[PDB]
Amino acid sequence: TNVKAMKYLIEHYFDNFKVDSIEIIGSGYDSVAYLVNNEYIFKTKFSKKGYAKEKAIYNFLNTNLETNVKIPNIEYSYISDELSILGYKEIKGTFLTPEIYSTMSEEEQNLLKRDIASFLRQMHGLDYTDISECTIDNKQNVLEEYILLRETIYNDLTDIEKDYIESFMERLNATTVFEGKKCLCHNDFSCNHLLLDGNNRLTGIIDFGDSGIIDEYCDFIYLLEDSEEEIGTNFGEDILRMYGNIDIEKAKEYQDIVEEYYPIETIVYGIKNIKQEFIENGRKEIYKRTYK
Ligand SMILES: NC[C@H]1O[C@H](O[C@H]2[C@H](O)[C@@H](O[C@H]3O[C@H](CO)[C@@H](O)[C@H](N)[C@H]3O)[C@H](N)C[C@@H]2N)[C@H](O)[C@@H](O)[C@@H]1O
Ligand SMILES: Nc1nc2c(ncn2[C@@H]2O[C@H](COP(=O)(O)OP(=O)(O)NP(=O)(O)O)[C@@H](O)[C@H]2O)c(=O)[nH]1
Ligand SMILES: [Cl-]
Ligand SMILES: [Mg+2]
Ligand SMILES: [Mg+2]
Numbered sequence: 194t195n196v197k198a199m200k201y202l203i204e205h206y207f208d209n210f211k212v213d214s215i216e217i218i219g220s221g222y223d224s225v226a227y228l229v230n231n232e233y234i235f236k237t238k239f240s241k242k243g244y245a246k247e248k249a250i251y252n253f254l255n256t257n258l259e260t261n262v263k264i265p266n267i268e269y270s271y272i273s274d275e276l277s278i279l280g281y282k283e284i285k286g287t288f289l290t291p292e293i294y295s296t297m298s299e300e301e302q303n304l305l306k307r308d309i310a311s312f313l314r315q316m317h318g319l320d321y322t323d324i325s326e327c328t329i330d331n332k333q334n335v336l337e338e339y340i341l342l343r344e345t346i347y348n349d350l351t352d353i354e355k356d357y358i359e360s361f362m363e364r365l366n367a368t369t370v371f372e373g374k375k376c377l378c379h380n381d382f383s384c385n386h387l388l389l390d391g392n393n394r395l396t397g398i399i400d401f402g403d404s405g406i407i408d409e410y411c412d413f414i415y416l417l418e419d420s421e422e423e424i425g426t427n428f429g430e431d432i433l434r435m436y437g438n439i440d441i442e443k444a445k446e447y448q449d450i451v452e453e454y455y456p457i458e459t460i461v462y463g464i465k466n467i468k469q470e471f472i473e474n475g476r477k478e479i480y481k482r483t484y485k
Pocket of ligand 4: 386400
C-alpha cells in the first residue's frame, strides 16, 4: 500500500480531488503510475530529473497537433525537486503487442502502419520553436557518459568489456547518422506505448517522457527493433516507406548503434543512480552479446 501514501499526496496537493479508488497500473524503476477512480492516470516520481519537460511537451502538442490520435492531456500537476506528479484522463484501449499484430488482417496491419506514419509525419513536421529548449544531442550525451565511465569504473572492467565499449566508441566516431534532420520526436516509440481501439486502429499514444528535439531517425528505433517486445524490422521498414523522404538505411544504422549502446547505457544508469544491479546487468549483457 504505496497506494495509501499516494492517495494522501494526490488529495493533499490537488485541493478538491477525491480518491474513491486507486491501484498501481505501471511501474518503472524510478517511477510509479496509478489508475485513480477507474478514470485518471497519475504518473509519479520522487526526484530536475522530474516531469517538467514532459508536461511542457504535452502542453505544446495538445496545442499544436491536429490529429484524432489521443495523447495525455495534463489536468493536474505538482512539480518539485523531490516529487513530481502528472494527472490526466486515461486513454482507453489495448496496447499493441506482437501477438495482437499477428492476428490482424493484412488491411488492418496496413492501416495501423499508415496511422503511425501519419502521426510521426505530423509531429516531426511541427515548428518546434516554442519548445526549442527541449533539445537532445545523443552523440554528445554518449561522449559525456563515456567520460563518466572513465572517471568511475572503467579501470575495473574486464578487457572484454573494455573492448566492447571502445569498439562502440569507434563506431560512434565514424558514423554520419547524427548529421541529419532534427525535429521533435516521441523518443520512446515502442509498442507498449501505442493504444488500439476495438477496430485495431491506432487510438492513442502515451509516455512522451523522453521526447525532445533530436534526430528524426530516433522515432524508428523501436519500430525497427527485432526482439520479443517489438513487432519486427519489416514493420518499421514498411512504416518508413509510408512516412517517406527518409534514408531507410541510415535509420537502420541509427537503430543498430542505439541497440549496441544499450548495455553501456544500462551500466551508466547504474553508476548515476548508485544501483549495482544495473552495473552488473549491463556487463553481463556485454558477454551475452559478445558470445552470440
Ligand atoms: N527490455 C529488453 C529490450 O530492451 C531494449 O528495448 C526496449 C527499451 O529498453 C524500451 O525503452 C526503455 O529503455 C530506454 C533506454 O534503453 C529508455 O530510454 C526508455 N525510457 C525505456 O522505456 C522501449 N520502450 C522498448 C524496447 N523494446 C533493447 O533495445 C532490446 O534489445 C531488449 O530486448
Ligand atoms: N490504458 C492506458 N494506460 C496508460 C495510460 N498512461 C499510462 N498507462 C499505463 O501506465 C504505464 C506507465 O505509463 P508510462 O508513461 O509509460 O510511465 P513509465 O514509463 O513507467 N515512467 P517514465 O516515463 O517516467 O519512465 C504504461 O505502461 C501503461 O501501462 C493511458 O493513458 N492509458
Ligand atoms: Cl558489477
Ligand atoms: Mg513507459
Ligand atoms: Mg517514459
